[PDB]
Design a protein around this ligand. Structure first.
Ligand SMILES: [Ca+2]
Ligand SMILES: [Ca+2]
Ligand SMILES: [Ca+2]
Ligand code: NI
Lengths: 253, 253, 254
C-alpha cells in the first residue's frame, strides 16, 4: 500500500539486470525478485536471493531501463533460505547512461535485519533515471539479497508530422454562399497501433473578408489509425482562395 | 508463413524474461527460445527448454517490453531433448505494468503434444501489452517449454516543440510589394538522429488586407537534423506588421 | 577508453537484453560477458571471465536487443580473462525493424583479439542504426569465449500529448471593448507529464473583424505545468474577435 499505483520493475520484467559476480549458476539475478521462492525440498535450484561470489564492498546489482523512469522507492529483502542479508547499501544512478551520480552523495541507506521482512526506502527526492544500482556496504553472513524498484507508470507516444495539406489554388471555397467545405483525405505514412489525436493548424491563408469579417477553419474528420479527412471550410459570404495546414498526430500506449 | 512480417520477440532479444523457478542453472530462460538446441554430446549444458524447479500450476515465464506492443501470436514448443512439454496454458498480460489481466478470463489455450512440433495460437483479438506471461496448466513429464511471441513491428518517434518564432515588430513584410520573406534561423535544442519532418503554424497575426484579401504564409526551409530556416512570407501588395509561429519537429526510427 | 568518450556503454548500463546461441554451462553465460568482467579467481564454482559457447562451430552468437533504436558507433571485443581462449575474427549482423536482418560488410570478417585482456575496438565503417545487433564468431583460439561491449550515441526520449479544439466560445468577450483583451481557457493534460513540457498552440478556426483593415489575433499558453496550462486567446487595439479555436501539442523530454 505504500507503493500502490507504482510499477514493480523486476516483477514486470521491465529492466535488464547485471550483477558484479554470482556465487554460481543458481545464485544469480534470476533469483533476485522481491519475495522470490524456490523448491525448498531440492537443493539444486539454489538460493532465494542473488548472492555475489566475491565478498567485499565492490559488489552491485544494476537495473537498466531504456525508457526513462521516475524512481520512487527501492525495496530490499534478505535471502529467504539462509540467514544472509544486506544491512546497508548505497545507490547510484544515471539518466543519460554516460554520467553517473550517487544518491545522497554515496552515503549509506538502511537495509534489512532478517531474511524476509521488506524494508522500503523512498528516495529523499524521486530519482529520474534509466539505470540504477544497489551497492551493498555492510551485510550479515554474505552479500545476498532480493529487491524491487518502484517507478511511476510511464506513458509512451508515437507521433507523425504531415506537412502542407492544401486545398489547391482557387479552390471551391472561393465561390458561393453558406457553409462550404473542401475535403482532402490524408493517409499517415504508417498505420498507428491505436487511435491517434490530431492537431491540424494553418500555415498559409489566402482569403477575402466579408463585411470586414474573416471566417476560416480546418478540422480533421473521421480519424482512424490509418488517416483522416482534412476538412477546410468557410461560411457566410466569405470567399477563400486557398488554405494550407500542417498536422501532428499522436497515439498513446 | 502464418507469422510473416511479425517481430519474433525472443529471437530478437526484444524482451526481458523472468521465470517463477528454474530446475537449475542450465534449465533457465536462457534456453527458452523457439527451436533452441544445444550440444547433444555433452550433458552439462542442460535442457533444450526452460524447465521449472517446482511442478505445480503456479509456474510461469514472463516476457517484458518497455515499449508497448500489439501481440498477434504466441507459439509453444516442447522440450527438444526429452519427452516433456506443456499441453495447455493460460496467458496473462499488462499494458501499464500496474494492473494485470487474463486472456479468455484465464481459460486454457491449447499447447503441444510432442517435443518439436510448434503450436501457434493467434489471439482471438490482438493484445496490447508491455508484459505477457505463459502460465502452464497441464503438462507431459515436466513443466518444460520453448516459446515465441509475435508482435506487429513497432515505430519509434522523437519530437521537439519550439515556441514563439517571431518576425519582429514592423518587419520587412510590412513594406514593399510582390513576394517578400523574413527568414528566422531555428536551432533544435538537440540534434535529431535522423531527418525530422517539421510542422510550423501560426499563433499570432498582425496584418493588413489588400483589397479585402488576407495573404500570409510560414514554411520551413533547409531542414537538417540540427535546425531549419523559418520562412515567414506574404505576396501581392499586402503589408504584414508581424507574424509568430510555433513548431513541432518529429524524427522516426 | 578515450576513443569512446561520451558514448553509451550498453552492457555496462544494462541497456540491452542478451541472448546467446548456447552456454557451456550455467557459469559460462552472458551474465559473464561485460567488457572487463572479473570474478572470484580463488573459487572455481563461479566459472569463466567470459561468455563461452557449448557448441563450438561457426553458428554461435551473442545478440544484444534494444527496444529503442540506437546509433551504434563501435563494438569492442575482449578475450576470456581466466584462460587462453579468445575470438580472432567475427562477423556482425543487425536489424532495425526486428523483421529483416542485414550483414555488416555483407558478412565479411571483422578483426578480433589476440590475447585474453587487450580490448580491440571496431568502429563501424558507417554508424549503424539498429535495435538488435549480433556478434557471430568466425575463428577462435581454444574455444568460443568472449567479453564485449557496444557503444552508442546517447538517446533522447520524448513524450507528446495532442489536444484538440480549445475554444473561446461563440461571440466571446474579445468581440467587445477596446485595448488588450484576453479570454483564458484552462487546459488539463490527459495525463501528468514526468517533467515540464514545451507547448505549441496554434489556430484552426478564426472568426474576426478587422480594424481599419488590420487583423490582430493571438493565442499563447500561460502557466505551463506538468498537469496543464492556461490557453490565452487575445486581441488588442479596436479589433472585435467573435471566436477563435486552437489545437495544442505538448512535449516533455527525458
Ligand atoms: Ca508547412
Ligand atoms: Ca506560442
Ligand atoms: Ca482542431
Ligand atoms: Ni534483459
Amino acid at each position: 500500500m505504500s507503493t500502490q499505483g507504482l510499477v514493480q520493475l523486476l516483477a514486470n520484467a521491465q529492466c535488464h539486470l547485471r550483477t558484479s559476480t554470482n556465487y554460481n549458476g543458481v545464485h544469480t539475478q534470476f533469483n533476485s525478485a522481491l519475495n522470490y521462492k524456490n523448491n525448498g525440498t531440492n537443493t539444486i535450484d539454489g538460493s532465494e536471493a542473488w548472492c555475489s561470489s566475491i565478498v567485499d564492498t565492490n559488489q552491485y546489482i544494476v537495473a537498466g531501463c531504456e525508457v526513462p523512469r521516475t524512481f520512487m522507492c527501492v525495496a530490499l529483502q534478505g535471502r529467504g533460505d539462509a540467514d544472509q542479508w544486506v544491512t546497508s547499501y548505497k545507490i547510484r544512478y544515471s539518466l543519460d547512461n554516460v554520467s553517473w551520480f550517487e544518491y545522497r552523495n554515496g552515503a549509506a541507506v538502511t537495509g534489512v535485519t532478517d531474511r524476509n521482512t521488506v524494508v522500503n526506502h523512498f528516495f529523499d527526492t524521486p530519482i529520474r533515471a534509466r539505470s540504477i544500482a544497489i551497492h551493498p556496504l555492510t551485510w550479515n553472513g554474505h552479500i545476498s539479497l532480493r529487491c524491487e524498484f518502484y517507478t511511476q507508470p510511464v506513458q509512451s507516444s508515437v507521433t507523425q508530422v504531415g506537412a502542407d495539406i492544401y486545398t489547391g489554388d482557387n479552390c471551391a471555397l472561393n465561390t458561393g454562399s453558406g457553409k462550404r467545405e473542401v475535403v482532402v483525405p490524408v493517409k499517415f505514412q504508417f498505420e498507428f497501433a491505436t487511435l491517434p489525436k490530431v492537431a491540424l493548424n494553418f500555415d498559409q491563408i489566402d482569403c477575402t473578408d466579408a463585411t470586414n469579417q474573416t471566417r476560416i477553419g480546418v478540422q480533421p474528420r473521421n480519424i482512424t489509425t490509418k488517416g483522416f479527412d482534412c476538412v477546410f471550410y468557410t461560411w457566410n459570404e466569405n470567399k477563400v482562395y486557398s488554405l494550407r495546414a500542417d498536422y501532428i498526430a499522436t497515439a498513446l500506449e
